Each structure stands twice: as structure tokens, then as C-alpha cells.
Amino acid sequence: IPKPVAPAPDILRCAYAELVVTDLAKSRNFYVDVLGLHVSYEDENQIYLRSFEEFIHHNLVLTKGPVAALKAMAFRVRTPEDVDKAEAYYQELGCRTERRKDGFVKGIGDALRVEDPLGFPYEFFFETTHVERLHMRYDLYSAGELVRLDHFNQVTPDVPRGRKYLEDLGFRVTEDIQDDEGTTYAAWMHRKGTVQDTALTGGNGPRLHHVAFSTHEKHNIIQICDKMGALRISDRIERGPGRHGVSNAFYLYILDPDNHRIEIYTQDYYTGDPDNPTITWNVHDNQRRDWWGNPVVPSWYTEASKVLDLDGNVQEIIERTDDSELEVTIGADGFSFTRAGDEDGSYHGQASKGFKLG
Amino acid sequence: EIPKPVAPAPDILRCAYAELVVTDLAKSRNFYVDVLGLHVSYEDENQIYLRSFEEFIHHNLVLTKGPVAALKAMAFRVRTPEDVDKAEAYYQELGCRTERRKDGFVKGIGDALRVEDPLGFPYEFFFETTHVERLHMRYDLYSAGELVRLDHFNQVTPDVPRGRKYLEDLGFRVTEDIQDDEGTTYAAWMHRKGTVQDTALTGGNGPRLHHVAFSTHEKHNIIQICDKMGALRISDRIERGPGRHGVSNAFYLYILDPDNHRIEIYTQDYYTGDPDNPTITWNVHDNQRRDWWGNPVVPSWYTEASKVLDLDGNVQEIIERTDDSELEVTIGADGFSFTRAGDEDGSYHGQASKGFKLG
Amino acid sequence: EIPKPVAPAPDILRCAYAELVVTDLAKSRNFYVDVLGLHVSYEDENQIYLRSFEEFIHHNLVLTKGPVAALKAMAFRVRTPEDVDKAEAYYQELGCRTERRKDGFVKGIGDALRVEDPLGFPYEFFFETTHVERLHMRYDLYSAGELVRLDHFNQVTPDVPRGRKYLEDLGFRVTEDIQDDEGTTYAAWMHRKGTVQDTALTGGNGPRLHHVAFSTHEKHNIIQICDKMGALRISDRIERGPGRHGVSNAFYLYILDPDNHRIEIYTQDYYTGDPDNPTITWNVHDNQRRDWWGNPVVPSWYTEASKVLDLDGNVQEIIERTDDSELEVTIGADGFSFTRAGDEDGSYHGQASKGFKL
Amino acid sequence: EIPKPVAPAPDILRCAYAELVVTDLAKSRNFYVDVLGLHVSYEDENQIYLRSFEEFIHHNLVLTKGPVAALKAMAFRVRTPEDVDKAEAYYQELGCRTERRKDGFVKGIGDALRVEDPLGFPYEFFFETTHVERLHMRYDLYSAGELVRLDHFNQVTPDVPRGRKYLEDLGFRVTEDIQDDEGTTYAAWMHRKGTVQDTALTGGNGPRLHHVAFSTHEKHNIIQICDKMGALRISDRIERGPGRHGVSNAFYLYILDPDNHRIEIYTQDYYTGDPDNPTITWNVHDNQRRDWWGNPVVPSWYTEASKVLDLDGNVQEIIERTDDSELEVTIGADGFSFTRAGDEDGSYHGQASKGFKL
Numbered sequence A: 001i002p003k004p005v006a007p008a009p010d011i012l013r014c015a016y017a018e019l020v021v022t023d024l025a026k027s028r029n030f031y032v033d034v035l036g037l038h039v040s041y042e043d044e045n046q047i048y049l050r051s052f053e054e055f056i057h058h059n060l061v062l063t064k065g066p067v068a069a070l071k072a073m074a075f076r077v078r079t080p081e082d083v084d085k086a087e088a089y090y091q092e093l094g095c096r097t098e099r100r101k102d103g104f105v106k107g108i109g110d111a112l113r114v115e116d117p118l119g120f121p122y123e124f125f126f127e128t129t130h131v132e133r134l135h136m137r138y139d140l141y142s143a144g145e146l147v148r149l150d151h152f153n154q155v156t157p158d159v160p161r162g163r164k165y166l167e168d169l170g171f172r173v174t175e176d177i178q179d180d181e182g183t184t185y186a187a188w189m190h191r192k193g194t195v196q197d198t199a200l201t202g203g204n205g206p207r208l209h210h211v212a213f214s215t216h217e218k219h220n221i222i223q224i225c226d227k228m229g230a231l232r233i234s235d236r237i238e239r240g241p242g243r244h245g246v247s248n249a250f251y252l253y254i255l256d257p258d259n260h261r262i263e264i265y266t267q268d269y270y271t272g273d274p275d276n277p278t279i280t281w282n283v284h285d286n287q288r289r290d291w292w293g294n295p296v297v298p299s300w301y302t303e304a305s306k307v308l309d310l311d312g313n314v315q316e317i318i319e320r321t322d323d324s325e326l327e328v329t330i331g332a333d334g335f336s337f338t339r340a341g342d343e344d345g346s347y348h349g350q351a352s353k354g355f356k357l358g
Numbered sequence B: 001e002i003p004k005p006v007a008p009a010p011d012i013l014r015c016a017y018a019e020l021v022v023t024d025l026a027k028s029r030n031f032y033v034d035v036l037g038l039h040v041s042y043e044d045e046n047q048i049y050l051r052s053f054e055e056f057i058h059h060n061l062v063l064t065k066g067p068v069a070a071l072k073a074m075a076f077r078v079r080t081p082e083d084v085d086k087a088e089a090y091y092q093e094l095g096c097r098t099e100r101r102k103d104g105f106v107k108g109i110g111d112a113l114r115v116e117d118p119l120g121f122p123y124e125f126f127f128e129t130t131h132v133e134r135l136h137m138r139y140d141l142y143s144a145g146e147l148v149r150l151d152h153f154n155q156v157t158p159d160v161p162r163g164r165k166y167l168e169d170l171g172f173r174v175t176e177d178i179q180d181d182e183g184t185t186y187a188a189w190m191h192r193k194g195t196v197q198d199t200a201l202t203g204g205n206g207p208r209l210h211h212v213a214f215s216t217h218e219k220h221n222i223i224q225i226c227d228k229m230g231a232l233r234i235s236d237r238i239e240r241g242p243g244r245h246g247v248s249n250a251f252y253l254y255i256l257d258p259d260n261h262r263i264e265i266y267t268q269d270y271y272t273g274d275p276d277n278p279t280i281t282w283n284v285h286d287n288q289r290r291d292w293w294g295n296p297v298v299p300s301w302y303t304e305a306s307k308v309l310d311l312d313g314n315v316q317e318i319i320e321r322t323d324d325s326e327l328e329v330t331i332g333a334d335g336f337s338f339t340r341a342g343d344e345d346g347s348y349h350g351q352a353s354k355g356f357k358l359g
Numbered sequence C, D: 001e002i003p004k005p006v007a008p009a010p011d012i013l014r015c016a017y018a019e020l021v022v023t024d025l026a027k028s029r030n031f032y033v034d035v036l037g038l039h040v041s042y043e044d045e046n047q048i049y050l051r052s053f054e055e056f057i058h059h060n061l062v063l064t065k066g067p068v069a070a071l072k073a074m075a076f077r078v079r080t081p082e083d084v085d086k087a088e089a090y091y092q093e094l095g096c097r098t099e100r101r102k103d104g105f106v107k108g109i110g111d112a113l114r115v116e117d118p119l120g121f122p123y124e125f126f127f128e129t130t131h132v133e134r135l136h137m138r139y140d141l142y143s144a145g146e147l148v149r150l151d152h153f154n155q156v157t158p159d160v161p162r163g164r165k166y167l168e169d170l171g172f173r174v175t176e177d178i179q180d181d182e183g184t185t186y187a188a189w190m191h192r193k194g195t196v197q198d199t200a201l202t203g204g205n206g207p208r209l210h211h212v213a214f215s216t217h218e219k220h221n222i223i224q225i226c227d228k229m230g231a232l233r234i235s236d237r238i239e240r241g242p243g244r245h246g247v248s249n250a251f252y253l254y255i256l257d258p259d260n261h262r263i264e265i266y267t268q269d270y271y272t273g274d275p276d277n278p279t280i281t282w283n284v285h286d287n288q289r290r291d292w293w294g295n296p297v298v299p300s301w302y303t304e305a306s307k308v309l310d311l312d313g314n315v316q317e318i319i320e321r322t323d324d325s326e327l328e329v330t331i332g333a334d335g336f337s338f339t340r341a342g343d344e345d346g347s348y349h350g351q352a353s354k355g356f357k358l
């Protein structure tokens, strides 16, 4: 993917995702009643939701449709003129673009959507309707309150190809996972001064791995799990809670009614200095994904959401040919270590903590 | 059946300390003091005496050097000096071997009785103990992972109903248990001090010691223990968790000491002190009973536990459980678990939850 | 001196509930249910019965409509039905007015004894109570400020030693107290259940009820109550705190209900169940005794407390304390407190800590 | 008015470190290392260099032995080496005294410019710094009170609008301020990195340094600092808090070092990185603006602050504020504050909240 002559748009941060869902009422139950997100607008076709500290119109749009999928992952840009820059940048890349002066969803103004070089539906916008910032509305605060939108994670077959593209677009790599023979399994990259605004996971794609929201404290994440147990929907807790190695964040992954994966995340570190030290982890290091060594559940490696093109049809999936992280770590010929070079605390042909793949 | 003595039961206050035999005293000290932050009451070349942040009795844990790692004694404090005599009479009537030492078996304990109980466990009963500085407001010493109290023991024994009746006669009240619909009991929890447990029975081959549990103030303190173990690159010694228990409702973690003695870190169970405290029975197939979030129970939790000693210092012979295995009926190849009773969606057949099978 | 009966004391388990008379039942409901999140066991046009998250007995708090806000009863649960007989014999021997009702004074309590005790307080003793759903795992109902247990009462009485001896004869065990170097006792704490207190005596004009205290799980739950009260613009009803207590070592907050009944929120005191539990005496001039961080005690904490009723529903006459006043000797114009005993640096003369006077 | 230079502003990343002169280096070391747990990057008989848990630059705090306790420099990191030249030209155009050292003023910093800025404050601008081990996952070193980041400075200056305009020209964006209906500004907060502040202006006699602020992960970390100070019997060095701020919404604590330099501990403010981030203005009489729970602001917080040095190491002359005093108008004899605007209930006249006066 060549670097355009045209300047990249100045991207501020991840801003919202539009997810297609099959049953809007069941989705509302999950995101509003279980998770406590705040309704900015709703009707029979869509629900627009925001986090506790947000002032732009929404962080999540649920749109009723026939096939559950990512419709758009939206980044806010610094100025109105940056939408023009986005259009010219992606035009030069040869990508299909669509510009709407009055936006694609309610509460957004002039917006550009693109089918990007990795097959993902990106939106770029500046203009958005401001709403009441709920950051001191402690009369509304949930024991599991979701306070910010933090990041997206994308599944794509060739991580270096996507990384180079995102670097040209101005994202900076913070962390990655590699092996000794030069394969890259995952990379994390940011615009705002946190570990990530989007991230790439090696795998068959394009698929959307997850959308991540932040909490203030670790106990808020614990409460989400506790509430899911009380609602007898613990089967929708996919992975965690844990401490990540990469990012150092406390985390949880859960599954919405259409199997879209949502991460809850807190307490990663500042990355805003331009010489921020990068960190590379070895793929066999059993503390890289869960710092406590807990096993990564196989569905985390295999399952992700479909994404749509700009006509609303599902994007064709291209298979990864580089090595599989699942296979090399927890498969029958996989291994992981606790201490590099130590047989004690290593796992061969199975996961940590006494489990193999089901 | 273990008969109810005519002699009155000793008035037991609480679990008070465990004496563990360890093979390398310095390695064990690194774990309990440097990693876990327990406070040293006394040590020499043979023993380390340790206590939690809020304790005023001499110790909650004694580490004794010896050739075979094992539980040497699980000690309960009784209400009065006279209760030690009551304990002796009670266990004598049960036909158990007993040993009485007027000046104690370990430093910082006075008059004490040790017994080989009817389940083959080495119990101690004592009242007299040397008081030490209660560190409960020593926030200059407080660790991010601070262990604040000894909470309980957990014992592996083959016949849970048999053990449960004996402990009830001794004055423990059952707070929670796990049963199935076919009349099998897999585990029971029982108290004196008005929390969920002072000891507990886990069905399996025994006598073996499942774990000793310490409490923290808050859930973040348990998280910090995990985080510190990751930083020390000993995450392989985190056996299971952290999690929320179904039974007890406590936030928990299980870790393994250098001799594979299992330690639970525990917080925020509930008050049980009323005599009609409702007893909660969970079904063994309920996948929220042990981990409320449905995370799978690691197989070693069901299979591994510490040897225990008799009064001569020799390991007690193990008697095999003949009742159904909790591992086998839940996560084994013919096992079953559910998320919602009567719902096939979210049930597991012949494997564990979250996409795993037995290794 | 209150004599020790020949009759054996009833075996008291714990504090169990308070009945408070309130003047506007709907306003009190808004406070206890909507602000504080207590759970309704039963309500009608005259009464609201409330319980904490982990309770299995019918209630921990009864709000009763009446003309004069006051404590109507402070209730302790006893170990067996026969202990209610023991309580009746004990208080009859003390020469106190008693009243026995086989079917209870409030809903969800059976055979019960109410007494006008030697200090003028309306005590209830009961065993029988209707069990309800224990909500301890109902995380679907859990508030960010959740009140999990009833912990204790605190009583204002003019002669603390006289009250202390009576409560000891009744089986309460003193855990901590406050004295000076001239033989005056200002406060004492005493327990049945193995925590720092089930009731406590504060020196002052009485009988008056100082507070009822509820527990939370964690310190952040108390912080949330404060945050919520700010958001509701009722921060003027936060009286004192939040803080760390010296006595008890608990994290704490005091707030005021619509009738100015004081509620404490409390967490993480220590285990006192061993019979030789070490007692702790603090000097009244030690500025870490009430707030460990040295924050000043607001003067209303010393002067204001609720009326109590006799068994005919009339307010008990208030008897004035003649012993020295904790307020006067610490923060009044001729008061004194210290940070370090014998150190002039960090001491306060004729004023409160942190730069304030009254 | 301070005119805007034609020379381009240096691109400022963030606050980076402060150099404080202290009178007894060992006593200061015991406070910052033993009490507060900061990490040693370098020390000798004259200086101690300290950093927070998540820092990768050489230090966040330099303690320098000297005769008069004062701020020696408040340092901001700039984006590129060239921005140091830009800073030099900018301040030269402003007519300010500057000093350039190509090898730095303190260890672990390279090419650096120090200036006596137009408000009389010793600012440093640098890019080059020695990287050190980032301790962000060193949980074997983590304290119960761990300080994780340097967050901000707060400066006392007599004319807030004058300083505000100057800092805006320098690229800082205002997030929040405190004003009255007469048009007086009492304080402003302004940022470069995406948080509420990198520096802040407090109206008062100046130039003086009000505080340096460090972050924690969670609210319980701040509570622990208080608890530890109680156990060390130095609760007299807890000046204000802990509390919830109105401005910023952060949980906070102010403590005093051995030379009375004020240190704030701070957590959980909000994201401000979007260019149209909504600005919040509070009324000076709002009793929830500084402490959200309505707790009173101690008078020393308004009156006391640290001296600052000029580039010859002499104390800067103090200029007195002529605008209205926030102390006098809120908690002074002729002051007032409110809980609910327009409501005399929960208002305080000629005294502070919670029953206190000056």
C-alpha cells in the first residue's frame, strides 16, 4: 500500500462504531439495561448510545438489519478541512469513497466513508451534535459504568501490510507480538495518547474483533461480571476478567446478542510523547495477553464480526497464510512459557492452567 | 456414622493457625514473606511464625522444616482454658488419639491439645496464646496486597455427609453445600465465627488439606497479588482465579506455595452468625456455583491437595472416595454443566466452560 | 449505679433493626430508597420496611409516619425464643417498664419484648422474624453506593461509665473508648457480634439517638454516596466525612435524613470475637482518634441527635450531661488537641484542626 | 497585555518535571521516597532525581539542596529538538530573560532553555532526555499509595486573564474556570496533553507555585496516602481533602512536604483532546465547585504557596492581587456560598460550610 502524496487527515481519536444488529430490542436490553450506556436518540430502526464522559452525540449506533456486521468504524478528525483531506487521501489510494454533507447517521454532519485498503468501512468526520456531558451525573452512575470509548480491534491477514498503512495515516505503533523467525501476530497503534485507537489482530479478514469501552476502576469491570452472573448470562462472558500484558490494562470480553464482542478496559498508560518506547512481546510468552497466565479462550482467536462494504453487503474474507497465534501457543503443536527458556511453567500442546482446546 | 458424644463439645471461637511442614525454609519464607507480605512474629533455623495484618494472637501460620511437606496441625482457638479439657474429653469419647501439652506444641501457644480426628486430620485446640502488636492501623507497613486475617481451612475427605455430621456435633453450622439430585454431597462449608466458614469439606481422597485461606480488605488487593506474581514471573504459581465464588459470594484467588500447599486469598463473604442462617444448596451441574462468572474450574483444584500428618509425624494413609467425582460429573468426558437450569443454550457436555477440555 | 440482676442476661446476637418515626413518609422514602438504594420488604401508607443487600431477616429499618421524628425502637436479635423470656425477666428485675407482644410490634417480627431501659432507651428483643429473599448475589440490583448490612447503633447518654457497666452486665464487650487524664470517659464502643460495635455510647445530653450505621463492601461505595449527593445538589446533607476513624479503624461518612436522623455509612473495621480482644483507649485530645487524618469534627456531630420515644409514644425527657464536653475540651474556645503527644507542633489551641474554628 | 509573538510557539507536549529547592535533603528524601514511594533515578549529596511508576523519561521531580526553599524550574517537554530554538526565539521576542544550555541544567536532560516568563515563573523547555526503565508493570515495586504519573502544575498569579491569554498564545487550551457575575476570574485550568490540565492559574499574590500534582490509578491509592500519614503521625501535613473536585471531577488530596511545598495527589479527570472540548465555568459562590461534597476549603490553601527563583537563584518579588479574593468572597466575614443557586437553605454567609469559620 503506497504512501499517498496527499496529506493524511489529522485523526483525533476513535469516536463511534455503527453495528448492524438483528433484533433491536434484544440489543437494547444488552447495551442499555445490562451495560448502562446512555441513550442519545432512538427509534424503531436505530439506537444511538454514549458513554458517561462523552460530549459528542454518540459512541455506538445500533442499526437494525438482516445480517449482523460492522457497518462503520468512525474516527473524528481535527478540522472540517480534514474530511476533505481524507477524501483526497483515499481517492489517491484508489479506494471507494462516499461523502455525505449531512452525515450517514443522526448527530454527525459532513462525513466521508471509505472501503479502506484492508476492506474496512472507515468513517471520518468533524461535525457532531454536542450533548450533555454526563461526567458528574453520579445520580445516573452504574456500579459498572462505561465512561469512554477507547478503541477498535480489527482482524486482518497480513499485519505488517496493515501496520504500514496505518502508520502512513498517522497512527503510531505502541506494542506488538512477534516470534523469533520474524512473523507478526498483532500490533497496537494510537492517535490519542493512550495505547491504542485501533489495533490489528492477525487472522482471516476483514473482520471486526471488538469495540472497547473504558471504566474508571477495576471494580467496575468486576461488577459487570457479577451482574452477568445475576442475570444468568455468564455464558456471554467470553474471556477474563484479567490483566493484559500488552497495554497493561485490566480487561473483560463479553458477547452481545449478535455475538459482537465488546471489551471493557481500564488503566493503560500514556503514549503521547513522540519517542514513546515501543514494546514487542514474544508470541510464546504466556504473560503477553493475560499477565496472570490465564489461558486465552479459543473463540477469541477464531470468532469475529463480519464487516460491510458501502452497499451494505458483507466483505469477502481473505485467509491468513502467516502462522496462527492459536496454533503456535495452545494447539497440539503449540507451546508457551512463563519464563523464557524454562521448562518449568511451560505448556506444550495445550493451554495453561491444565486445559486443552475443546 | 460418627456418634454424638455425651461429653459437651468445646466452645470453638474460630480457626486460628495452621502448621505446615515445608522442605526448604528459605524458599518458603520468600513466598510467604517477600511475595505475600505476611508479618514475622518469630523465626529461627527450623521455623517461621507469621501473622496477618489485623491479628493480635502470636501467629496465623507456622512453617516448620521437615522431610515431607504436609499439614502438621490445623488449630482452632477455644473460648476458655476449660474448653481445652472439654476438647480432650470429647475426642477421647470419640475414640481418637490425643496429645496434651501444657506449654504448647509451637512457640506462642500455651496449653494445647492435638488430636487425630475421626476423619484423620490433625486438629489442635488451644486458648492460651502470646499476644503481639496488632498491626491493624500500621499503614506504614500496609502492602498493596495485604493479607488482613486468617479466614478458613478446607479439607479433602471421601465421605462428606459423614464428616459434616461430626462437625455439626462439634458445633459448626453448615452455611452452604453442593449436592446433586441423586443424593450425593460433593462439598460443604461450616462456621463458628459468623462468616461463611472456618473449615470446609471437599469430596475426594483423604485426609488431605485442600487449602488455607487468608482475607484481604478489598478486591483490588487480590488483583495486586496476581499482578505482583506476574511481575515476579511466577504466574505459573497462580492455580485458579481470580474470580467470584457462587458458594460464599467471595472474591477469590488460589495460589501454590513452593511445596504445592494451596493458599486461597478471599474477601467479602456474608454474615452467618444467626442460628437460623439460611443454608444454601447448589446443584453440582450449576456452572455458576464455584465461579459465578462461569469460568472453568482447573482440574488440579479437584485432584491435588496436601498430605497430612498423624501425631507421630508420619503421613496419614489416603482413603479413596467412592462417591461420585465432582470433576467427572461436571467437566469430565461424561460430564455436564448448565448456565440456566433446563436450558440447552449455555450448557456444556463432556467438557469445561469457555471452550476448554481437560488437559 | 445500675445493679447486676440475678436473672441471666438474654443471649444477644447482634443489632437487627431500628424503627424511626418520620414526618413525611414520601420524602423519607426518596432518601432511603432513591438516594441510598435500600430494598423495600413491605410498604403501605403508614410504614416502609427496608433491608440491606445481604439481609435475610425481614427488615433492618422501619420508617413509621408520626407527628414527631424520633427513635421508636432499637432492636436486637436474640439467640433463641427462650431468650425473649430471659430479657423480660432481666428487665423486670431491673425495675424497667416492659411490654411483650407474641405477634410483634411491627410486620415481619414475631414474639417481641420492648423495654424502657435504664438509660431511657426503647430497646426491643426478638427471635422470630419472617425470612425474605437474601439479595446478596442480586448484582442486577446492586447500586454503586450499595448498603450491604446493618452494622450498629450509637446512643447519646450523659454518664458513660454508668451506661457502660449496664451494657457489660447485659453481655456487650467494650472494644474501644475515649478518656482523658482526669478520669472522664467521653465515649465507649461495645459488641456482641464479632465486630467493633453493635451499640456505642457517646457522652451528651440524653437519651438521644446519635446514629444508625450501615456497611458497604468497599471504600469507593462510600465515596459514591458523596458523589451522588453532590449530583443531586444535596451536599448540605453530608454532615461529616468521608474519613478514616481512629476508633474502629473504619472508613466512614455521616449524612442526614429529611428529619435530621443521622445515618453513618461504614466499612472495614476488625474482628473482635475473641474474649480477650485487646481493648483500646484513646485520649480525648488526640486529634487522630475520631478522624485518623486529623480532619476536624464538625460541631453538629457533638450537639445534634434524635429524640427517642417511651413505650406510650411520647418523647423521653432529656437529662443534661455534667461531665466535661468533648466539643468544649477539643475544639471550643478553651479546647486543645494534638497530633503527636507532647509536641506543640501540630497542636491546636482554642480551635479546630486544619485552620478552622467554630 | 502580553502581545502574541510573531515567532511560532514551541509545540509543548506536557508538563514533565519540577525542580524544587529544599533545605534538608535527607528530610525531603524521607518524604518523597519513604512516605510517597517515588522512584530514584539518580542521587548524590546535593540532588535527588525521582520519577513516577509509569514514566520513561529520566525524572519527574528533582530535589536540589539550597538555602531557601523555592521552585527552581517548572519544565515542559516539547515535541522536537527544534522546538527548543522556537522557545528561545518566542521568549526573546517577549523580552524575557533566557538561558540556553546545550547539555542541560539537571542530569538526564539534554539541550534545554530556561526563562523568566512574563508572569515571573522559571519555565524550562526541553526535548532530549535520558530514557530509563519504565516501571509500569513492576508490580513487585508497587506501593499501596503508588504515584503513577506527573499530572500538572498550579501557579499563583495576581491577574488571571492576563496569564490566561499568554498561555493560550503558547498553545494551552482552557478547560475550566471560576468566575463571578461581576466578571472577575478567580482561577483557570489549561492543557496540552489530553487531560484537564498541564498547568493552572490560581488568583493570588505571585509569582508563587501553588502545587505540583501526581496521579494515582484509583481512589483507594489516595486514601492509603492519608492512612499512612496517620500511622506516621504526620496527619498535620494533610492540608486539604481527600475529596472530589468540582472543577476537573478528579478525586484529590493536598499534602505538605518538609519545606511546605504543596503536593496534590489526583485521579480520574476526563478527556479534553478534541479541539471543541466544552469549556466549563463555575460561579465562585458555588460551594460544590472546589469540593463537590461541599467540604470547606481550608484558608491556608488560598493564602500559602511556594516562592519561585529567578535565573540567578534569587527569590522573585511578589506582586499583590488587586482583583477580589476567592477566600474573602466565599468564606470571609463578608463572603458567602450556596449549595443550590438561589436557595438560602444550604447557603453559608460570613463563614465556611459544615459548621466552621476561619
Ligand SMILES: O=S(=O)(O)c1ccc(O)c(O)c1
Pocket (backbone or CB within 6 Å): A153, A212, A244, A245, A246, A247, A249, A263, A265, A288, A289, A290
Ligand atoms: O490480550 S492482549 O494483552 O494481547 C490485548 C491487549 C490490549 C487489548 O485492548 C486487547 O484487546 C488485547
Ligand SMILES: O=S(=O)(O)c1ccc(O)c(O)c1
Pocket (backbone or CB within 6 Å): D154, D213, D245, D246, D247, D248, D250, D264, D266, D289, D290, D291
Ligand atoms: O479545588 S478545585 O476543584 O478548584 C481544583 C481542581 C483541580 C485541581 O487540580 C486543583 O488543584 C483544584
Ligand SMILES: [Ca+2]
Pocket (backbone or CB within 6 Å): B180, B181, B182
Ligand atoms: Ca442427576
Ligand SMILES: [Cl-]
Pocket (backbone or CB within 6 Å): B245, B289, B290, B291
Ligand atoms: Cl470454588
Ligand SMILES: [Cl-]
Pocket (backbone or CB within 6 Å): C245, C289, C290, C291
Ligand atoms: Cl468519630
Ligand SMILES: [Fe+2]
Pocket (backbone or CB within 6 Å): A151, A152, A153, A199, A210, A212, A263
Ligand atoms: Fe482491545
Ligand SMILES: [Fe+2]
Pocket (backbone or CB within 6 Å): B152, B153, B154, B200, B211, B213, B264
Ligand atoms: Fe476456600
Ligand SMILES: [Fe+2]
Pocket (backbone or CB within 6 Å): C152, C153, C154, C211, C213, C264
Ligand atoms: Fe458509628
Ligand SMILES: [Fe+2]
Pocket (backbone or CB within 6 Å): D152, D154, D211, D213, D264
Ligand atoms: Fe491541582
